[PDB]
Design an enzyme around this catalytic site. Structure first.
Site, PDB file in Angstrom:
ATOM      1  N   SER A  61      21.232  52.934   1.060  1.00  0.00           N
ATOM      2  CA  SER A  61      22.386  53.007   0.182  1.00  0.00           C
ATOM      3  C   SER A  61      23.695  52.552   0.809  1.00  0.00           C
ATOM      4  CB  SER A  61      22.597  54.420  -0.373  1.00  0.00           C
ATOM      5  OG  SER A  61      21.642  54.667  -1.377  1.00  0.00           O
ATOM      6  N   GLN A 117      17.064  56.912  -9.953  1.00  0.00           N
ATOM      7  CA  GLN A 117      16.110  55.831  -9.705  1.00  0.00           C
ATOM      8  C   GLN A 117      15.827  55.055 -10.986  1.00  0.00           C
ATOM      9  OE1 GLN A 117      14.313  59.477  -9.206  1.00  0.00           O
ATOM     10  NE2 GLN A 117      13.405  59.201  -7.165  1.00  0.00           N
ATOM     11  N   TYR A 147      25.112  60.473  -8.837  1.00  0.00           N
ATOM     12  CA  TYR A 147      24.836  59.335  -7.948  1.00  0.00           C
ATOM     13  C   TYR A 147      23.575  58.650  -8.432  1.00  0.00           C
ATOM     14  CZ  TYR A 147      23.998  56.954  -3.463  1.00  0.00           C
ATOM     15  OH  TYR A 147      23.802  56.052  -2.482  1.00  0.00           O
ATOM     16  N   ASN A 149      21.197  54.810  -8.382  1.00  0.00           N
ATOM     17  CA  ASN A 149      20.939  53.395  -8.142  1.00  0.00           C
ATOM     18  C   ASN A 149      20.971  52.602  -9.413  1.00  0.00           C
ATOM     19  OD1 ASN A 149      20.456  53.724  -5.402  1.00  0.00           O
ATOM     20  ND2 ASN A 149      18.400  54.480  -5.790  1.00  0.00           N
ATOM     21  N   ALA A 315      19.692  55.682   2.949  1.00  0.00           N
ATOM     22  CA  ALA A 315      18.316  55.947   3.387  1.00  0.00           C
ATOM     23  C   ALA A 315      17.371  55.005   2.697  1.00  0.00           C
ATOM     24  CB  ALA A 315      17.916  57.386   3.044  1.00  0.00           C
ATOM     25  N   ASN A 340      14.355  58.419   8.287  1.00  0.00           N
ATOM     26  CA  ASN A 340      15.303  59.018   7.317  1.00  0.00           C
ATOM     27  C   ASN A 340      15.432  60.515   7.645  1.00  0.00           C
ATOM     28  OD1 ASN A 340      16.748  59.931   5.069  1.00  0.00           O
ATOM     29  ND2 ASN A 340      15.045  59.596   3.620  1.00  0.00           N
TER      30      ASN A 340
END
Ligand SMILES: NS(=O)(=O)c1cc(Cl)sc1C(=O)O
Length: 358
Positions: A61, A117, A147, A149, A315, A340
Site C-alpha cells: 500500500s 478489496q 480504507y 483498495n 503490506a 508482513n
C-alpha cells in the site's frame, strides 16, 4: 554513516528483526536531507541471496503514495479536478448511487463504504464496471472513511484517462522518470529479477498475486535507494524541476479530511508534528487503520503543512513496508522487509529512530 545514526538504527532494528523473525530488511534514514543505508539478512533464503541496496521489495500500500502524487500531477496539469464527478471519467457508471461521488471521495476512501478489496472474481474490465455499478454505499459521500483498495485504485485508473496513457506508462513518464527512480517498477522486468526479493508468509516464498487495480493500489516494487529518493522528493517538493510534479507532490500532502488526530492526503496520511507516539503507533494497527470512522471535512483543504509527520504503511502477502518523514526537520525513514509483520512494530521502530535524530 555518522556513528549516532549507525547506533540509533542498529539498536532499534536488530531487536526488531529478531523479535519479528524478519528474513531480510533494508532501511534508509534521510538526515539533514542525505540518505544513509542499512541492510540485513536475506532477499532469498533458499538461494542464500543477501538483501542489498539494489534489492527490490514489494511496497504494497505504500504504492498509494505514488498513485496519490500521479493524481496530483494530473490535477496540476489541468487534466482532472478532485471536484469532478466520478462519472465524468466513466460515463458508463450510470447507477444513481454514484451521483455526488467525486474523484476526491475515491482518492480519500470517503465515497461511502467501497470495500477494502476488489473481489477476486473481478477480472475483466466489464467485471469491474459491473462491480462498481452494483455496489451499494452504506453511507453518504464524504461522511465516513473506510480504507479501501477499490476506492483509491479506481481513482488512479480514472486519473490517467485524459492523458490517454496506461496507468503504468503515466506513472513511468510522469513520476518515476523525472525523479530518477530507475529501479522502481509496476511490473518487474526480466533484467531485474535477480534483484527481486521473495516475500515470506508462514515460511513460504511468495510474490504479489495479480488482481484488478493492483498497479494502482498495491503494485509497486522498489529498492531502498529509490525509496530514499522518493522520501527526499516528498520532503522537498519545491526542489523538483517539473512544475506539475512539484505541485502534485504538494497536493498529495494537503489535508482533506480529519479523523481523530490523523489527516488524509492523497495516498499519504499526516499528523501534526510533534506527534504523540502512542497515537501514531497504536493508530497504525490495522484494528484502527482499516476501520470505518467518521470524518470531518477540511474546508478548504490545508496545503502541505511542514510541521507534520507524514507516513504510509504497506503490506503484501509476503512484504511489510513503512515510510515516514517530517518536512520541517529534513528527516525521514524507509523500512522495507520481506515479511508482513505488524504495523505497530514498524511505527514504533521508526519513531524511536526519528525521535532520537530530531
Ligand atoms: N492480489 S491480492 O491478493 O488482492 C493482494 C492485495 C494486496 Cl493489498 S497484497 C495482495 C497480494 O497478492 O499479495
Amino acid at each position: 554513516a555518522p556513528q549516532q545514526i549507525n547506533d540509533i538504527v542498529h539498536r532499534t532494528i536488530t531487536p526488531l528483526i529478531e523479535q519479528q523473525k524478519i528474513p531480510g530488511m533494508a532501511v534508509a534514514v534521510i538526515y539533514q536531507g542525505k540518505p544513509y543505508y542499512f541492510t540485513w539478512g536475506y532477499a532469498d533464503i533458499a538461494k542464500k541471496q543477501p538483501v542489498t541496496q539494489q534489492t527490490l521489495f514489494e511496497l504494497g500500500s505504500v504504492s498509494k503514495t505514488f498513485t496519490g502524487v500521479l493524481g496530483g500531477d494530473a490535477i496540476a496539469r489541468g487534466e482532472i479536478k478532485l471536484s469532478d464527478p466520478t462519472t465524468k471519467y466513466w460515463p458508463e457508471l450510470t447507477a444513481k448511487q454514484w451521483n455526488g461521488i467525486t474523484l476526491l471521495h475515491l482518492a480519500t476512501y470517503t465515497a461511502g463504504g467501497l470495500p477494502l478489496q476488489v473481489p477476486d472474481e473481478v477480472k475483466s474490465s466489464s467485471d469491474l464496471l459491473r462491480f462498481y455499478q452494483n455496489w451499494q454505499p452504506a453511507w453518504a459521500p464524504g461522511t465516513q472513511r473506510l480504507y479501501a483498495n477499490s476506492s483509491i485504485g479506481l481513482f488512479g485508473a480514472l486519473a490517467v484517462k485524459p492523458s490517454g496513457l496506461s496507468f503504468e506508462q503515466a506513472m513511468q513518464t510522469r513520476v518515476f522518470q523525472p525523479l530518477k527512480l530507475n529501479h522502481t517498477w509496476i511490473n518487474v522486468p526480466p533484467a531485474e529479477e535477480k534483484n527481486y526479493a521473495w516475500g515470506y508468509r508462514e515460511g513460504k516464498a511468495v510474490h504479489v498475486s495479480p488482481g484488478a487495480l493492483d498497479a494502482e493500489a498495491y503494485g509497486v516494487k522498489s529498492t531502498i535507494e529509490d525509496m530514499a529518493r522518493w522520501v527526499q522528493s516528498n520532503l522537498k517538493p519545491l526542489d523538483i524541476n517539473e512544475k506539475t510534479l512539484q505541485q502534485g507532490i504538494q497536493l498529495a500532502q494537503s489535508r482533506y479530511w480529519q479523523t481523530g488526530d490523523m489527516y488524509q492526503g492523497l495516498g499519504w496520511e499526516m499528523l501534526d508534528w510533534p506527534v504523540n507516539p502512542d497515537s501514531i503507533i497504536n493508530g497504525s494497527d490495522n484494528k484502527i487503520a482499516l476501520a470505518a470512522r467518521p470524518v470531518k471535512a477540511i474546508t478548504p483543504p490545508t496545503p502541505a503543512v511542514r510541521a507534520s509527520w507524514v507516513h504510509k504503511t504497506g503490506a503484501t502477502g509476503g512484504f511489510g513496508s513503512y515510510v515516514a518523514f517530517i518536512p520541517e526537520k529534513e528527516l525521514g525513514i524507509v523500512m522495507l522487509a520481506n515479511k508482513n509483520y505488524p504495523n505497530p512494530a514498524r511505527v514504533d521502530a521508526a519513531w524511536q529512530i526519528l525521535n532520537a535524530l530530531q
